[model samples]
Target chain A: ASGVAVSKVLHLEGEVNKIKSALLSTNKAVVSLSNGVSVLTSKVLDLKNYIDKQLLPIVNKQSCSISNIETVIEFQQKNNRLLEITREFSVNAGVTTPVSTYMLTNSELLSLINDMPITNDQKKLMSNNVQIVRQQSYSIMSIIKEEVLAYVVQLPLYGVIDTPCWKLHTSPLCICLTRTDRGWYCDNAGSVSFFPQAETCKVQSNRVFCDTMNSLTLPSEVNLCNVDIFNPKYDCKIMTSKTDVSSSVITSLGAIVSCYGKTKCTASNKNRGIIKTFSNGCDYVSNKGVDTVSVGNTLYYVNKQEGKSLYVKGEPIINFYDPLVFPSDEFDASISQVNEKINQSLAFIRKSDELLGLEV
Target chain B: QNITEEFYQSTCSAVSKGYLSALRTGWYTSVITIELSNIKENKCNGTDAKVKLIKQELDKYKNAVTELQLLM
Candidate 1:
């Protein structure tokens, strides 16, 4: 065995270290209830620093205006109890995996969001923002739940990633698609490590990767610009009419075929999705079918009311971290083969009526 | 999100299908369009056809006997 030369050293900590600790400490806890407690708990410590450092000065000196930050006060409220839970968790250990893992169960999450250091209003001012941040933050933490899940499941690759919370976000799905070994190869966390090519398309870098929403079956390799998919959940036609997209979503299979076919989504020209506003219902029916909304975070026109009741252009840029990356299917651990799997972990899974963290 | 489809179906068809009879001079009925909100862009581009009818009637009025055409 050759164990002499070390080419480079990396100083990775946090989840990376947590993964090592869990692997060393617990036996089958990852299979049953390994909820990546450190990522959540340690992140609160990071959250505390973010609150203590930037929040007050930014608010007071107006280095960033109240509207600029998602109201720094929200972070204070988040840490108010956020650190409370971390302290309870921290008492058990110093820098161990159990401290880093353990996502909040659903009721815990719901109660956590009940105070919503975030929401539509921020800085205690009437705003078109916190209901905005609060909503997106819910998506952020929820999807981040899966981010840490990627850790517990043990795929042991550095490239496949789960860090969308700190990145630029345009859609509601908070699954981070970029980074890791995939290197922007995948768009959302759910798309990672499918049964190989079963759910992926050959679009990114002319390479095959799982992009569940970005039209998997799109054959005849296309570049990134034309690589788009229409989301049925917010699909414009189905948004009204209730046309039962069950047929269309499948039959429509994949068709962002021509949109932005040549245009690249660059740092400058991000709005290549090119959406127009049409408020009149007929105008919408006429034009809505013409313009397509790609699943990418790039710009596209939604109804001026955000597709609520009409089709007019609202601000196309949605900064709600990455809810777009959360799997549309959001499948649970089927593990129907209880004898084959999930057997080792069942004893620890105590019953909870409102605990949804174990599921999604 | 609100149901404007029935409102448009009922109102636009009425305007298109002669639900409002032509006026005495055969001009399009403005009174019938009182609550009709979708004239600018109709379902079938019916406004395109409605515009032609308005032009034909306006042309007829303009081409009426010279003295009357100038006066009216």
Candidate 2:
């Protein structure tokens, strides 16, 4: 009985050992499974974190950019509508009027003429003259309108010289004055007068004198020769030397005068007894008292009541021989103001068209 | 015999736990893949057909996981 009990105990011990070995194997498998699961979880977490950190921000930025694009499209649409309205307003408000139509209407042309410093009669005369010229030649009218008007507008600043016998009926008419050693001669016939002895007369007083014709009060000591005072016909010639009595003339005063050693001689109209002292040699022959006097080489022709120096017809009133006169400061300033306003308006129109995409 | 019976029960419980864990991992993987597909869809306007293909692939993976569970 003791031997049988010992054998049974050994068998039970072997079974216990087998069960313990199986339990250890199961624990090892569970540990490995847990480790594998942990590694997979860690990998998934790493992928998720990478997506969140790297990709999501880029995606969010893309979404933001798309939103901004939508906003820009909407703004462009609204801006296009506003431009359409502005273009319509510009058309309706007559901003598209042609510059020629705006500037060259009859009333505008009349206004431009009225702005000039001319008398009403002179203006009427000038208007008629321009109309006649225009009827005759369109090219001439254009030149007068553009070039002549520009010259006329600046007349007051440049002084003009004329003889006492020549009268100007227009305010802006330029008289050609020829300078010689003796005096200033109106290229048109007139009594000769000397202005201040200068190369050019640019003084404001001279301009005033030319404009008004009232500033020329003759000095008492100077002699005025009225050769045409006789009954429409007279011929006279005088010469001088430093010797006396080489040539003598019997005057109306009954005194015999010698041409030599005499500084001057006086002649009178046969009927009017108007005496004219010849300081310089004046030689003339009058047909029906249409007297033509020659001083040095310049000839002065006598008209019915006046004598005028001759000039070429249809010549421009201003030339290089005379001094240049600019327009008044006020007039130039007004033109500048108009130019600035026009420039601003043009800029506004240009910008409006550009915005409307209509500049072409 | 009692000890052997107890050991058999513990082993069965461990295996069942491992199979359930595998199924849960597959489910999580399918969810994450579906999320990835949605993100890709938002990125491309013409991604509808491609998204369907991704969904089919995910379904295949899930089906394979289910079959593995059944075998387990």
Please name the candidate that would achieve the greatest DockQ relative to the true structure: 1
Residues A1-360, candidate 1, lDDT per residue (tens digit)? 233222222333445887787766666665444457656788889999998898866756664353344344444343433543445435643222211113232233334445445542322221211122222121112122412321111111122322221111111111111111112233334432212233333222222323334333221221221223243332211122222111001011211211122333211112344443322111111223433332233333222212223333333232233323554443343434445465645534533322744641
Clashing pairs in 2: A188-A309, A189-A307, A189-A308, A189-A309, A190-A307, A232-A288, A232-A289, A233-A289, A243-A260, A243-A261
Off by over 4 Å in 1: A1-83, A86-303, A306-360, B1-72
Cα error of candidate 2 at position A347, Å: 91
iRMS, model 2 (angstroms): 50.8
Candidate lDDT scores, in order, read 0.30, 0.39
Highest-TM-score candidate: 2
How would you encode candidate 2's per-residue C-alpha lDDT over A153-240 as one tens digit per residue? 1112213323333321100000111111232323322323434333322223222122224233333223322222122232211222
DockQ of each: 0.01, 0.00
Badly placed stretches (over 4 Å) of model 2 are A1-4, A85-94, A97-360, B1-72
